[PDB]
Design a protein around this ligand. Structure first.
Ligand code: EX7
Ligand code: EX7
Ligand code: EX7
Ligand code: EX7
Ligand code: EX7
Ligand code: EX7
Lengths: 156, 160, 160, 160, 156, 156
């Protein structure tokens, strides 16, 4: 049983770690799949985001980190994945998540989207919020893996 | 991984929306328990025995589905059944805040039980057992939303 | 086009918010039926006869409004009345998901009936018959939210 | 400014979420009245006398908190108590539209009373007295969500 | 009775077709009004969007397609329209729709905003989502009129 | 008792005036704090936004208008503020407001976020909406203080 957890992960946060950890407790193999996402003009290059996520998930034996620029549904088919994991924080996210999941189902009917709920601890954070605080030199050590925090400090 | 999943609800009665969710759950988990609550607080249209028999008949074609009634706190039942996955259907019209409250409470009660949210087909994304019953009680056509055995049982229930 | 529109609800009692919606509906459709549900499930404060008389008096100045009671599934009543438009008021505080469920169910029941959502004035965007009744029962001033005849009827109802 | 604030609710029973909100309110307002509604419509698990005593004991460490029962429209009670601030707790799972309806209605009733929304700790952002009671009635562990005196009272209530 | 259905329509989708068709069953004349929308940096020029919508709605006799750069309320007044149609997909859209409708009411009190609900089939699609899938070469034939699909393929 | 009311205020609207007025009826001193917000690419410079807000709030004796480029939580600590005011218009705003308030609480636990509800009159307006209408020469006199309206007319 192979699951894909796709996203921009710009950068990967403790919220993302929480979701991928939950996914590994449920599925045999989890592919953490980092989308290139040029339209979002990411802070970190795809190569940097992949390296950060690889380092942050090395303790989890059944996580494979990969980058992709393809249509997500095509990438999931090409990874032999039948489960698509997404984290569900709030209502505003849920509605866009429904659109994406219905589109993905149209593109690959056998790829089942599943939503996981993060810990209360990470229910109010996002990569965007963490970057905004860090741009103003605010302490974000609590929200990121150590290697990501260092990389964000170094980047800024 | 030999995962056991539970899909709890009142299933009063079981709809095509519930069939769609339980079908999707069987494609990703080895064993799925469709767990029917006594749900005395709501005062159900169908008795637990009727709800169980309707659900067994409607899911008989799915080999890895077990239909079972329960009267305890769902988390207590999931624990006793050795389930590690809790299936929740998320319709386009679901109370998202309530689902969050429920999942956090279930996680407090049984941390080893993971809540997983599945999405039904667009076809069943706007219905509920509640709306189906209300429409049928008021002489509306609900055949499209139900398994054939459920349609027959509901017609018989409303006739008396 | 000689469009017939229906504006259903419990109108228990009719408020300035309902008057605002029905007024807007008369400006765009030739004939508007303000359709009052028996709504026995909720157990209304005012009887159907009281609700109808209050609504007739409050809408008498609108020439193309017909106030009518109904006990069937609203879609069944809209079909029998040859209505092709179903008016729903959408307040800033409406249950959007419920409105979607209702409109899709109404479309399944009668495809030729189009649900149209109208927006009330900002003035009435945060009230409901439910909140108005609760406030009045608890000795609060609701005069501002009601037609004068409704204010008089509600005071008389609460006095006994 | 010698501000008097009111924090109304049914507190059936008072939870750690309510304690968190009332604590935050005492840090910004000089006097906080924790106002317990008779709330007969809901039919509460605990009587008003039980709810008041539980809340007094759970807030005794907060010097500027006064626990008081009330049976009038909350706005009528706030007016008589010379309160100019109305505390509302806003959980991650609150009915935002309902809070808006309530605040606008309270502003219509008493314009000099300002509704202020406080946010509880992430720890209590997904609970309610309703969910806590439901879980406890169904043999679930709710100790974590309640003050110790409330936990003892709830166990005694459910035992009989 | 004249109704205006305004939007960016970048490009027009089957969801938009569904709404305009419903609008023609209710009102005598429907103006499908395409806003220039430079702030949104559209994929298609106004002239292209107008031509695509004209071709896509030619089967509906009481639809007139027009482009505009004016304040929408002024354009509706200038078209003698008294009805403003908008499609209502989800909660997140509904709130911004309320702001726009209350502003339009302030600008032109007699222009009544009316919301129509799309078919379940088109309830999870948007021009943005279709463009995102098409940018990654994903199949969008199901969501667009034939002429629009060809034009989107040709544009990309 | 010192409260801070932070925001981009690009430009300050009658909705913002309504909130700051409510805040002064509750707290002894209110700092209306204008964030530089370069990421939002504001129409008005920080100096212009500060001057507009100063003029618009001069009638309120206990309002101090200040600009800032710092982390908001650091600025609140540096202003000796213990209350953070935000206006709550709708559901979509509420969710992002929760994230910001939980982050601010992590950065400064003693700074209490409080939400105030605007008048029905201003419940559907925003700086963005007012600028959009004004860009198309629509009448926005009703939504802005006189000095702001003149400045917006002059800017456009
Ligand atoms: O399969 C898909 C269906 C619908 C839209 C989609 N957009 C893509 C492009 C890749 C991408 C971009 C941003 C973020 C991610 Cl996780 C992936 N694939 C999609
Ligand atoms: O595990 C739980 C956690 C929180 C609340 C819940 N209430 C129950 C009681 C049983 C019940 C009632 C209605 C429907 C079902 Cl599926 C089950 N279990 C829950
Ligand atoms: O056409 C309908 C479709 C779906 C559900 C609905 N329930 C009814 C029953 C009648 C009713 C009850 C309360 C209020 C009114 Cl306005 C009407 N009609 C509906
Ligand atoms: O001032 C008010 C305005 C609007 C509605 C309200 N309903 C009441 C009645 C009393 C009550 C009932 C339940 C819970 C409480 Cl805290 C108070 N007061 C309200
Ligand atoms: O009448 C109006 C009221 C409020 C805002 C408005 N913005 C405009 C500009 C034209 C425009 C831009 C984008 C999309 C459309 Cl459909 C129209 N008119 C407006
Ligand atoms: O304390 C904070 C916590 C979380 C995010 C934050 N972003 C900032 C930067 C300043 C800023 C930018 C835009 C708008 C405002 Cl009101 C303030 N401070 C923050």
């Amino acid at each position: 049983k192979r699951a894909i957890y796709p996203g921009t992960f710009d950068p990967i946060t403790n919220g993302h770690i929480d979701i991928v950890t939950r996914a590994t407790q449920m599925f045999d193999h989890v592919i953490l799949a980092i989308a290139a996402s040029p339209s979002k003009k990411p802070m970190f290059t795809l190569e940097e985001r992949v390296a950060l996520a690889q380092q942050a998930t090395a303790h989890l034996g059944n996580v494979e980190v990969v980058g992709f620029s393809d249509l997500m549904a095509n990438f999931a088919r090409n990874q032999h994945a039948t489960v698509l994991i997404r984290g569900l924080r709030a209502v505003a996210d849920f509605e866009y998540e429904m659109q994406l999941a219905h589109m993905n189902r149209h593109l690959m009917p056998e790829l089942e989207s599943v939503f996981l709920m993060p810990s209360k601890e990470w229910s109010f954070i996002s990569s965007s919020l963490v970057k905004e605080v860090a741009r103003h030199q605010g302490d974000v050590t609590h929200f990121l893996p150590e290697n990501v925090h260092q990389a964000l400090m170094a980047k800024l």
